Design a protein around this nucleic acid. Structure first.
Ligand code: ZN
Ligand code: ZN
Ligand code: ZN
Ligand code: ZN
Lengths: 54, 54
DNA sequence: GGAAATATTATATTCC
DNA sequence: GGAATATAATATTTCC
């Protein structure tokens, strides 16, 4: 239903989607590259980052 | 000095960077996937998309 | 310097 | 269901 981020007002599809959005305001970045120590917000963004390391 | 959008006031690094942004207003999508026919505003985004077909 | 490419990132869309 | 994936758009780096 309405997965409201009660700080920006925006709506989201899942309970995980809104949760992934929460780390915009908090700034968690819970996934770190094994090669360059870069922190990323989502597992998917860290993956596509791994293509600088070819 | 700058290259700011007539329409949303965002400003960009270069002439070419502003042209790319303005495509979000015009809906201009010059980069067309030969497989599925989908269109993209940037050459870079089409090439990422190309790798989704295999 | 500036076009171009690349890296980046927030979030819809996908998929049985 | 909800993680993987694809998208849109901008920011940074590369390249001549
Ligand atoms: Zn929010
Ligand atoms: Zn890395
Ligand atoms: Zn604009
Ligand atoms: Zn395609």
């Amino acid at each position: 239903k309405q997965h409201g981020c009660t700080r920006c007002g925006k709506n989201f599809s899942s309970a995980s989607a809104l949760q992934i959005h929460e780390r915009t305001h908090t700034g968690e970045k819970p996934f770190v590259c094994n090669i360059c120590g870069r922190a990323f917000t989502t597992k998917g963004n860290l993956k596509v980052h791994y293509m600088t390391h070819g």
